[PDB]
């Protein structure tokens, strides 16, 4: 029981770094790559957990 609690209650802090696509876009990059990564990267960042649905079932 204690393991599951510690497992669920483990805190995650790693200082999620910010990406400056303009910097990489300027210094050097393959044409269409830096932009393709940004648009695809941003799309997944929008997705987030649906805490509401889980809150109800439990």
């Amino acid at each position: 029981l204690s393991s599951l609690v510690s497992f669920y209650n483990k805190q995650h802090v790693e200082q999620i770094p910010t990406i400056d696509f303009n910097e990489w876009k300027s210094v050097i990059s393959t044409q269409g790559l830096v932009d393709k990564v940004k648009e695809n990267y941003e799309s997944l960042i929008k997705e987030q957990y649906n805490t509401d649905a889980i809150s109800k079932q439990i």
Partner: peptide, 29 residues
């Protein structure tokens, strides 16, 4: 920015759980 989303979602689950207090009213009825 993800931390801002984390805190917002965190409070959501709290309010959703406290809603269980409404279920207690069902028993009284």
């Amino acid at each position: 920015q993800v931390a801002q989303a984390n805190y917002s979602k965190f409070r959501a689950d709290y309010s959703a759980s406290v809603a269980a207090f409404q279920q207690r009213i069902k028993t009284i009825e």
